[PDB]
Design an enzyme around this catalytic site. Structure first.
Site, mmCIF file in Angstrom:
data_model
loop_
_atom_site.group_PDB
_atom_site.id
_atom_site.type_symbol
_atom_site.label_atom_id
_atom_site.label_comp_id
_atom_site.label_asym_id
_atom_site.label_seq_id
_atom_site.Cartn_x
_atom_site.Cartn_y
_atom_site.Cartn_z
ATOM 1 N N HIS A 131 -41.628 4.472 2.901
ATOM 2 C CA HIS A 131 -40.633 5.193 3.694
ATOM 3 C C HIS A 131 -40.180 6.385 2.861
ATOM 4 C CE1 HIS A 131 -40.297 2.340 6.852
ATOM 5 N NE2 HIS A 131 -39.731 1.398 6.121
ATOM 6 N N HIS A 140 -42.453 2.965 10.424
ATOM 7 C CA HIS A 140 -43.191 1.727 10.653
ATOM 8 C C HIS A 140 -44.455 1.934 11.478
ATOM 9 C CE1 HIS A 140 -39.160 -0.441 9.890
ATOM 10 N NE2 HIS A 140 -39.912 -0.479 8.805
ATOM 11 N N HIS A 183 -44.383 -0.678 0.595
ATOM 12 C CA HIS A 183 -43.803 -0.358 1.887
ATOM 13 C C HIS A 183 -42.474 0.404 1.768
ATOM 14 C CE1 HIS A 183 -42.891 -1.617 6.217
ATOM 15 N NE2 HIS A 183 -41.692 -1.294 5.773
ATOM 16 N N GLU A 184 -41.575 -0.035 0.896
ATOM 17 C CA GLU A 184 -40.328 0.685 0.780
ATOM 18 C C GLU A 184 -40.593 2.092 0.187
ATOM 19 O OE1 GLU A 184 -38.346 -0.591 2.615
ATOM 20 O OE2 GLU A 184 -39.134 -2.621 2.584
HETATM 21 ZN ZN LIG Z 1 -39.771 -0.760 6.626
#
Ligand SMILES: [Zn+2]
Ligand code: NA
Lengths: 121, 256
Positions: free
Chosen positions: B191, B197, B187-188
């Site tokens: 980005h 999101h 997830h990181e």
């Molecule tokens: Zn996030």
């Protein structure tokens, strides 16, 4: 940004502020790497933080969601907000307990009122 | 150009990770990170960003830096690997946003030579925050995310790069599970690859449990058992595809 939800009774005591303020005001953006955001809100019933910061007016959050910035809404419905006090200000993040007062179920508001316990101390 | 298909990353383990996760053992720390990154790479490489044949894009470790002990600092000064937490010492953890900035500031020199830099730590960030990262972008002048593009820090008086993010494997006084840790980093790095999101309301990209659960870019980490948990939503795909199609030529390298 990634958060792991947990208990709201724990979140309640861990937070400096717990209010049911409104966002009838608006949001203001600032400069910087990605930016900062500051919401102007009219407080109402404070459930916690009478000491630390009695009555709040400005809530600060990161502008970028990836950096845990908080996303609210202008002149809209009420929110049950939580946050922290740092250098005379209140900061809330995506990981902080936040919920539309509308969505707040009868069960939850009942647990919210279980503030009488004030457990914290 | 499916030649430059790999974002090489500088992986950094601070002294808290070394002590608390690696139990003060180098091999344990090293193996934990390599295996975690390999599982994150598995998700990435098998993802078809266009639902077609645009896949094989992934992440590979260019180098692992394990800080065995806290950084010594002259009073008044701070460093991401120092013994104490900042700004509030008494706490177990730093202010999460402030730690990422400090890491970016201190790793500048090294981050300038890699696609991405990621800090792995072990501290209990407030309100259950597991990690965060600067979002990437296809915009030719993007500062954050994949590919170092110097950003001048006025107070730092130097170039720092926002091609970074961090993961903590500690939460509420407990060690999280590998399955959860892998998804935090996915997830990181997500980005970093340009994803935002997964939105609700639209929920085509945020399915309910009875549909497979949330996709990796959902902000609430929760579990990792549902099928969608290890996959990118259509929302992330579009977003990441543009970023890759634009930045791969700039800093991606050949696999292995
Ligand atoms: Zn996030
Ligand atoms: Na935590």
């Amino acid at each position: 940004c990634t958060c792991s939800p947990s208990h709201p009774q724990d979140a309640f005591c861990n937070s400096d502020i717990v209010i049911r303020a409104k966002v009838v005001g608006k949001k203001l953006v600032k400069e910087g790497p990605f930016g900062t955001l500051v919401y102007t809100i009219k407080q109402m019933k404070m459930y916690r933080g009478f000491t630390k910061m009695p009555h709040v007016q400005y809530i600060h959050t990161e502008a970028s969601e990836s950096l845990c910035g908080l996303k609210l809404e202008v002149n809209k419905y009420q929110y049950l907000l939580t946050g922290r006090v740092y250098d005379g200000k209140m900061y809330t993040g995506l990981c902080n307990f936040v919920e539309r007062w509308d969505q707040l179920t009868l069960s939850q508001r009942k647990g919210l009122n279980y503030r009488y316990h004030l457990g914290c101390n | 150009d499916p030649m430059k298909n790999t974002c090489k990353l500088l992986v950094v383990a601070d002294h808290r990770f070394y002590r608390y996760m690696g139990r003060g053992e180098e091999s344990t720390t090293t193996n934990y990170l390599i295996e975690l990154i390999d599982r994150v790479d598995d998700i990435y490489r098998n993802t078809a960003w266009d639902n077609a044949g645009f896949k094989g894009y992934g992440i590979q470790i260019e180098q692992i830096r394990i800080l065995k002990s806290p950084q010594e600092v002259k009073p008044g000064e701070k460093h991401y690997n120092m013994a104490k937490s900042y700004p509030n010492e008494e706490k177990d953890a730093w202010d999460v946003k402030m730690l990422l900035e400090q890491f970016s500031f201190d790793i500048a020199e090294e981050a300038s030579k890699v696609c991405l830099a990621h800090l792995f730590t072990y501290q209990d960030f407030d309100m259950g925050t597991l990690g965060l990262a600067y979002v990437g972008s296809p915009r030719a002048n993007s500062h954050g995310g994949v590919c170092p593009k110097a950003y001048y820090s006025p107070v730092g008086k130097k170039n720092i790069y926002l091609n970074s993010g961090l993961t903590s494997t500690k939460n509420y006084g407990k060690t999280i599970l590998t399955k959860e840790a892998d998804l935090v980093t996915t997830h990181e790095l997500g980005h970093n690859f340009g994803a935002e999101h997964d939105p609700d309301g639209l929920a085509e990209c945020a399915p309910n449990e009875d549909q497979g659960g949330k996709y990796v870019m959902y902000p609430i980490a929760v579990s990792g058992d549902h099928e969608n948990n290890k996959m990118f939503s259509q929302c992330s795909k579009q977003s990441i595809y543009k970023t890759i199609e634009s930045k791969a030529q700039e800093c991606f390298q050949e696999r292995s």
